[PDB]
RNA sequence: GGGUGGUGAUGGCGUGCCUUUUGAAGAAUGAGCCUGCGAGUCAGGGACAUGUCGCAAGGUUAACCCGUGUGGGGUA
RNA sequence: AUGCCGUGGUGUAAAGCGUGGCAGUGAGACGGCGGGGGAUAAGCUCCGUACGUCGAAAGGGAAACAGCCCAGAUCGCCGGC
RNA sequence: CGCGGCACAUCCACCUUGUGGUGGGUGUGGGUAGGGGAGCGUCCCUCAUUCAGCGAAGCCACCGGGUGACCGGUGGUGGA
């Protein structure tokens, strides 16, 4: 019988990811993996493994100027002609944390469990986060050499 | 013995017109699918004696 | 201590006293079997070498021949009238491992 | 529309052509090449036929050859 | 010899409805609707008995790869390393010992690293 | 001298001559291997089914 | 004509090998 | 002694009768007729 | 701790059944549900082919006759 | 060039052939290659092709996706390639 | 491919060497129309045998079983 995690076997930690020069896609993949728990050998696709992820300095995620001008975020209200266009560039000015979180959410599996997964994600525009009551360990992006 | 659809009492008219009623077309009230209708391939009187040879 | 023991085209991690269900062996209830190992871990040591673990065998005691769950197959294809009904009970053996 | 079916007829295919090829053993009377005109000519031991059929007078092996430009079919016994 | 059908007929109906217990709506109440869902259920079960052999190995590889990159190796190269080292421990037990005995898993990573060629990227 | 032929691709979709040539070599399924003498007939067969097999001069 | 062209162009995928029904 | 219940037909003398149109596991719905035309419902005379 | 039985958070996979079609989950047909009923049968020294059994250069009777019967006669 | 006919070797179990019993089928589809018709249009139409697949073929790939690519499901496995 | 179960065809060796069994090979086992083969269940009759008011049939539940149709056991209900 292959191990299936119980209720209570999930130990959750807290990480802070600095987004100061990280390419937005790299950041989003790392956050999604870390917040799902793909990195821990106890992983099960039907379980909320995974840790809490605080992204800070979301304002300075690395997005190239061409994407800042041309990559468009699309939102349909459900009314006719209710397609609203924004640009990554202007969501960076208004809601940069929304840009980062939207990237994460797109990386997450499209299913009920991910609705609980994304509850463990905090994204902040500034360099400060209110979640210092824990001891959120910084997490840098690394690539395992092959 | 049983009674085929032609030997069952009645069943002469077409019970209703072929088209327009919204029902299955039927042809006769004594068709085998009807309860009280004729029996299809039912037992008929038979003689089961065989002609076994004398020396057998 | 435990070892990764190979039997029935499969392999299982067992520790002395473990009861394991395996493919059918031609051994009656009560007699010993010796089974090759793919790995032995004695705590902090593994030694993970084919020549080294060719000479160690997991010793097991056949507790009995059991029979797997009833699998009920009814192969069905959509608009053809095809139906195939089968059943199947896999024959298994239970071994209490006492070796390593 | 135009009734341009002015040309929609044809005759039956007559299954012409070589019926027994070189080096192939045949019995007497067996037709070797059925054809129109003398596309092949009767060689030794080969008869021609009323419709130019090139049969075998004798049993043996079919062989093809050239006889002064004329291409011929013969049987070697 | 007129034969009533019910005694023989009800046998397969009882079996189908018993197998259809737990189904919702008419699929657990009505033999005709339960039988259709039984054909689907047994087709699905047949499909998934041979699909779970890929499903569990997918899960084993996921766990193995997670443990491997805790020990700073990709699953890619850890599988080479075990092949070259001659370790024939399958991914069932590799994942299960990655969970139960992480130190033994680290030892296996060490032997796999050692068995890897020095330049894992040059032709052989 | 003595060729060693392993079937690596399916006969599904193969032409008559390829299927019958694999049959003639005696190849039955993927990673079946047969040993046959390296004569002209064998190399003609292998040429017909070249894309479906790999061969080696194995003793 | 867009639906037709897009359906026709999706043969040009590696898995299809330049070939596709209709 | 030989009784009425020691009595038995010769092997292969009594073959079973094929009951047509009795489900998919046997000669099923179309009963071997397979068809939608004349043969599906009638006989074609040998002279035709 | 372990095993039954019930339930099933959550993850994956997953286009009803029948008919009929090149092709239907099909937005083609039929079916609201259940129970009951509802379709290759029988006759004939028919015909062909087969399996089997009896007798065999023969085989077999039909009508009919006699028997409580399924038995015995009966050569046309 | 292929293809075809014959022939001699080699290979290949479920080749072939004759003669009986019982069939069904005789609406095909798409894809490759060669052509006609069409406007070298059509998911068009009509042929050819010891060409394929579907039909009657599940599994894997192609997002989904009969007809494309891989591969032909006797059953079981929480083994491997 | 590995390990285990089944089946079909065919081959080789022992047993009354074909009614054929046993062991072992080898190959094979997607399938519509359709062909062939072998079975499950219901009822009735005959023969034998065996249960049944200390409880048959039918039905219900549960536990088991067979490669399938399906089967058995136990209990409840019931009354021939
Ligand atoms: Mg009348
Ligand atoms: Mg009328
Ligand atoms: Mg009446
Ligand atoms: Mg008489
Ligand atoms: Mg169909
Ligand atoms: Mg002409
Ligand atoms: Mg004349
Ligand atoms: Mg349920
Ligand atoms: Mg697999
Ligand atoms: Mg039906
Ligand atoms: Mg027909
Ligand atoms: Mg038709
Ligand atoms: Mg019909
Ligand atoms: Mg059809
Ligand atoms: Mg149509
Ligand atoms: Mg409909
Ligand atoms: Mg609908
Ligand atoms: Mg219609
Ligand atoms: Mg309706
Ligand atoms: Mg016609
Ligand atoms: Mg036609
Ligand atoms: Mg055509
Ligand atoms: Mg063309
Ligand atoms: Mg067309
Ligand atoms: Mg074509
Ligand atoms: Mg398919
Ligand atoms: Mg597929
Ligand atoms: Mg898919
Ligand atoms: Mg691999
Ligand atoms: Mg089959
Ligand atoms: Mg197969
Ligand atoms: Mg059939
Ligand atoms: Mg009483
Ligand atoms: Mg009582
Ligand atoms: Mg009764
Ligand atoms: Mg019961
Ligand atoms: Mg009882
Ligand atoms: Mg009772």
């Amino acid at each position: 019988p292959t191990y299936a995690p119980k209720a209570g076997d999930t130990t959750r930690s807290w990480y802070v990811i600095d987004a100061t020069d990280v390419v937005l896609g790299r950041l989003a993949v790392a956050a999604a993996n870390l917040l799902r728990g793909k990195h821990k050998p106890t992983f099960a696709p039907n379980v909320d493994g995974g840790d809490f992820v605080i992204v800070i300095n979301a304002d300075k995620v690395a997005i190239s100027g061409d994407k800042l001008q041309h990559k468009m975020v699309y939102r349909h209200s459900g009314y006719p002609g209710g397609l609203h266009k924004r640009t990554i560039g202007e969501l960076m000015q208004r809601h940069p944390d929304r840009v980062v979180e939207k990237a994460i959410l797109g990386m997450l599996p499209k299913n009920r469990l991910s609705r609980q997964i994304q509850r463990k994600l905090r994204v902040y525009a500034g360099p400060e986060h209110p979640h210092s009551a824990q001891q959120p360990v910084p997490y840098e992006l690394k690539q395992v050499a092959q | 013995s049983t009674k085929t659809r032609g030997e069952v009492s009645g069943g002469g008219r077409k019970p209703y017109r072929q088209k327009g009623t919204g029902r299955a077309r039927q042809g006769s009230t004594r068709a085998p699918q009807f309860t009280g209708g004729g029996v299809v391939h039912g037992p008929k009187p038979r003689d089961y004696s065989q002609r076994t040879p004398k020396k057998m | 201590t435990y070892a990764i023991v190979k039997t029935g085209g499969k392999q299982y991690k067992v520790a002395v006293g473990d009861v394991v269900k395996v493919e059918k062996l031609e051994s009656e209830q009560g007699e010993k079997v010796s089974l090759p190992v793919a790995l032995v871990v004695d705590g902090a040591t593994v030694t993970t070498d084919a020549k080294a673990l060719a000479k160690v065998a997991v010793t097991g005691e056949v507790l009995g021949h059991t029979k797997g769950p009833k699998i009920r197959i009814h192969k069905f294809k959509n608009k053809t009238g095809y139906h195939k009904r089968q059943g199947h009970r896999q024959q298994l053996t239970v071994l209490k491992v006492t070796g390593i | 529309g135009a009734s341009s079916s002015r040309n929609g007829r044809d005759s039956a295919a007559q299954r012409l052509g070589v019926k027994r090829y070189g080096g192939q053993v045949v019995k007497a009377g067996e037709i070797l090449v059925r054809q129109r005109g003398t596309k092949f000519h009767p060689g030794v031991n080969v008869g021609r036929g009323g419709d130019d059929t090139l049969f075998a007078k004798t049993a043996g092996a079919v062989e093809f050859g050239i006889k002064r430009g004329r291409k011929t079919v013969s049987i070697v016994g | 010899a007129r034969v009533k059908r019910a005694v023989n007929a009800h046998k397969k109906r009882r079996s189908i409805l018993k197998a259809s217990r737990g189904y919702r709506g008419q699929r657990s109440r009505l033999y005709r609707k339960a039988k259709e869902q039984q054909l689907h259920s047994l087709n699905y079960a047949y499909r998934d008995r041979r699909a779970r052999k890929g499903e569990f190995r997918k899960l084993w590889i996921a766990r193995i790869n997670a443990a491997a990159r805790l020990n700073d190796i990709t699953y890619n190269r850890l599988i080479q390393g075990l092949k070259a080292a001659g370790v024939e421990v399958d991914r069932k037990n590799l994942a299960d010992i990655a969970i139960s005995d992480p130190a033994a898993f680290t030892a296996l990573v060490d032997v796999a690293r050692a068995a890897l060629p020095e330049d894992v990227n040059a032709p052989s | 001298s003595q060729l060693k032929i392993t079937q690596v691709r399916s006969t599904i979709g193969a032409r008559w001559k390829q299927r019958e040539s694999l049959r003639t070599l005696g190849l039955r399924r993927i990673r079946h291997s047969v040993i046959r003498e390296d004569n002209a007939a064998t190399r003609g067969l292998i040429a017909v089914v070249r894309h479906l097999v790999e061969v080696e001069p194995a003793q | 004509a867009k639906r037709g062209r897009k359906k026709r162009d999706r043969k040009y995928s590696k898995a299809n090998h330049g070939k596709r029904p209709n | 002694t030989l009784k009425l219940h020691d009595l038995r037909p010769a092997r292969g003398s009594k073959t079973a009768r094929t009951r047509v149109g009795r489900g998919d596991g046997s000669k099923g719905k179309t009963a071997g007729r397979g068809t939608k035309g004349t043969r599906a419902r009638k006989q074609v005379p040998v002279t035709f």
Side-chain angles (χ1 to χ4, degrees):
Chain A
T2 283
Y3 162 99
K6 291 327 190 33
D9 295 340
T10 324
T11 85
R12 284 193 226 271
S13 72
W14 286 76
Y15 307 98
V16 194
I17 297 181
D18 192 7
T20 307
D21 295 335
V22 197
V23 156
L24 155 69
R26 212 171 333 279
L27 168 60
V29 164
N33 278 351
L34 183 61
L35 155 77
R36 268 176 105 204
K38 293 289 287 294
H39 71 284
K40 60 224 307 153
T42 206
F43 170 72
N46 79 313
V47 184
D48 219 332
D51 315 284
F52 276 79
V53 175
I54 286 63
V55 177
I56 44 60
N57 310 309
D59 36 357
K60 33 213 82 173
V61 301
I63 310 187
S64 65
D66 50 296
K67 290 179 183 177
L68 277 192
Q69 291 309 96
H70 295 348
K71 182 176 172 61
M72 308 268 321
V73 169
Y74 279 115
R75 264 185 74 81
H76 203 279
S77 67
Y79 291 83
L83 194 71
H84 314 306
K85 265 212 305 312
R86 291 242 199 251
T87 284
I88 290 308
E90 40 210 27
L91 312 183
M92 280 327 270
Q93 333 297 306
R94 298 169 11 101
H95 308 107
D97 77 69
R98 277 248 298 281
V99 195
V100 153
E101 148 158 2
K102 182 205 154 94
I104 324 306
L105 272 36
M107 320 258 171
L108 281 173
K110 257 83 45 193
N111 81 11
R112 295 186 182 186
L113 195 72
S114 309
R115 207 168 289 110
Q116 327 171 9
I117 274 44
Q118 52 197 255
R119 284 201 253 280
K120 309 185 299 323
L121 165 88
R122 311 304 191 231
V123 182
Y124 297 104
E128 285 317 339
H129 63 88
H131 309 286
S132 34
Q134 293 84 22
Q135 285 76 29
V137 45
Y139 163 105
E140 280 65 14
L141 260 58
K142 40 213 91 63
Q143 181 176 359
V144 177
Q146 173 176 168
Chain B
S1 176
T2 84
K3 191 168 315 327
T4 87
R5 64 174 287 169
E7 304 155 319
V8 171
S9 156
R13 65 204 36 201
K14 186 174 174 68
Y16 40 86
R17 64 169 200 310
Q18 182 121 326
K19 297 178 75 64
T21 61
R23 306 289 299 315
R25 65 265 186 105
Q26 291 305 332
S28 176
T29 58
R30 303 301 191 191
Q33 67 267 14
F34 286 71
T35 89
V39 177
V40 161
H41 306 312
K44 281 318 190 273
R46 290 197 286 168
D47 159 28
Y48 305 64
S49 67
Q50 300 175 357
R51 303 163 52 79
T52 325
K54 295 137 178 283
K55 31 189 90 153
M56 287 180 78
Chain C
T1 178
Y2 69 105
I4 275 172
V5 48
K6 294 165 327 162
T7 184
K10 291 177 282 292
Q11 81 218 15
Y12 320 72
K13 73 185 315 272
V14 315
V16 152
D18 261 12
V19 154
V20 79
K21 184 126 46 73
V22 295
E23 295 290 335
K24 177 173 69 66
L25 288 340
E26 309 319 358
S27 271
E28 299 69 67
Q29 219 189 264
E31 79 242 43
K32 316 333 306 303
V33 298
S34 266
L35 296 171
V37 279
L39 185 93
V40 195
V41 177
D42 212 280
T45 161
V46 163
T47 313
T48 175
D49 171 338
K51 302 254 208 43
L53 42 62
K55 323 159 324 181
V56 47
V58 153
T59 278
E61 186 289 310
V62 178
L63 312 172
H65 291 343
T66 200
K67 176 126 53 40
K70 180 73 187 295
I71 279 53
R72 281 189 190 294
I73 301 123
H74 188 173
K75 302 207 252 184
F76 168 71
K77 261 167 203 341
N78 201 2
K79 291 180 173 63
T80 77
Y82 180 73
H83 297 275
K84 215 194 271 303
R85 296 164 178 83
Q86 323 190 17
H88 168 117
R89 302 288 294 272
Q90 193 79 5
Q91 336 207 333
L92 326 176
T93 324
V94 202
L95 317 154
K96 197 166 136 83
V97 312
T98 89
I100 307 196
Chain D
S3 298
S4 179
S5 66
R6 214 177 38 61
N7 45 24
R9 78 215 66 82
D10 185 23
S11 72
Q14 314 299 28
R15 279 81 177 174
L16 286 195
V18 161
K19 249 68 146 152
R20 295 290 184 270
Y21 292 90
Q24 189 172 0
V25 183
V26 309
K27 338 165 173 191
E30 145 151 18
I31 96 103
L32 322 168
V33 23
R34 159 117 55 191
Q35 98 269 35
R36 218 42 65 185
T38 202
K39 183 183 288 291
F40 309 66
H41 280 270
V44 47
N45 272 342
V46 154
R48 160 90 170 280
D51 71 336
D52 324 287
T53 319
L54 299 198
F55 43 99
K57 334 290 287 313
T58 89
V62 198
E63 79 158 317
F64 292 85
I66 298 278
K67 285 316 280 142
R68 186 145 64 91
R70 306 224 298 220
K71 99 175 73 93
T72 79
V73 188
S74 34
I75 306 112
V76 288
Chain E
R2 182 170 183 265
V3 199
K4 296 302 236 283
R5 288 183 287 152
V7 160
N8 165 67
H10 287 190
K11 290 180 182 178
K12 65 180 182 294
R13 302 179 195 169
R14 276 155 217 141
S15 64
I16 289 266
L17 305 175
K18 215 199 93 207
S20 299
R21 249 138 56 180
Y23 289 23
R24 78 138 55 190
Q26 315 171 340
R27 320 209 190 202
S28 70
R29 292 171 173 88
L30 307 190
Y31 164 85
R32 289 167 62 248
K33 277 89 172 64
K35 196 175 79 173
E36 295 158 34
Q37 194 64 43
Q38 283 298 294
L39 322 165
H40 296 293
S41 293
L42 295 175
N43 263 1
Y44 284 157
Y46 176 82
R47 185 204 48 181
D48 292 326
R49 282 191 302 275
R50 30 196 76 217
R52 53 158 93 111
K53 300 171 175 64
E55 265 269 83
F56 278 94
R57 144 166 201 150
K58 162 186 286 263
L59 167 72
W60 295 332
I61 307 158
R63 294 183 180 177
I64 286 182
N65 185 12
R69 332 193 163 210
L70 314 149
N71 317 104
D72 223 3
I73 181 51
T74 72
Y75 166 99
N76 192 311
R77 305 293 180 184
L78 161 85
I79 267 47
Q80 291 191 266
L82 309 145
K83 260 127 181 63
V87 155
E88 70 172 83
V89 154
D90 65 16
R91 325 161 152 87
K92 195 168 108 203
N93 309 125
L94 275 183
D96 153 28
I97 76 94
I99 294 206
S100 62
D101 204 344
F105 190 82
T106 303
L108 284 160
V109 192
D110 291 346
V111 320
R113 228 179 280 290
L116 277 182
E118 298 317 326
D119 181 316
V120 89
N121 259 339
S124 177
Chain F
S1 68
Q2 172 105 324
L3 283 181
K4 163 35 162 23
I5 316 147
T6 279
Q7 183 194 338
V8 313
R9 313 226 56 111
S10 174
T11 45
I12 284 163
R15 326 263 290 242
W16 194 235
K17 293 185 187 293
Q18 286 130 18
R19 315 208 279 306
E20 307 299 305
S21 323
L22 283 193
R23 182 182 62 84
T24 313
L25 297 319
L27 283 174
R28 299 233 200 241
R29 63 193 82 71
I30 296 333
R31 308 144 165 215
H32 212 188
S33 34
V34 304
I35 313 269
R36 333 209 92 221
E37 310 68 338
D38 185 337
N39 37 57
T42 299
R43 311 194 280 299
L45 278 165
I46 294 167
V48 153
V49 296
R50 193 41 146 281
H51 62 282
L52 301 177
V53 315
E54 47 199 344
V55 317
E56 67 223 338
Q59 173 296 338
Chain G
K2 185 175 75 69
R3 183 193 67 129
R5 305 173 320 222
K6 290 207 29 183
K7 307 222 291 212
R8 236 131 39 220
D9 297 337
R10 63 176 174 173
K11 338 179 302 208
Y12 300 122
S13 65
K14 156 150 279 302
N16 266 195
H17 312 66
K19 259 191 309 153
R20 163 96 73 149
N22 320 49
Chain H
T1 60
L2 198 74
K3 284 327 279 313
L4 260 188
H5 62 279
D6 318 301
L7 202 62
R8 151 187 316 83
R11 193 97 181 280
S13 100
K14 219 54 55 203
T15 95
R17 186 232 282 251
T18 88
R19 264 145 40 73
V20 103
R22 292 297 190 276
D24 294 303
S26 65
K27 194 151 325 203
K29 71 178 179 73
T30 60
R33 289 173 180 260
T35 304
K36 206 177 181 183
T38 294
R39 318 270 289 181
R41 296 179 187 91
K42 282 167 67 174
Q43 225 81 7
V44 178
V46 201
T47 88
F48 173 55

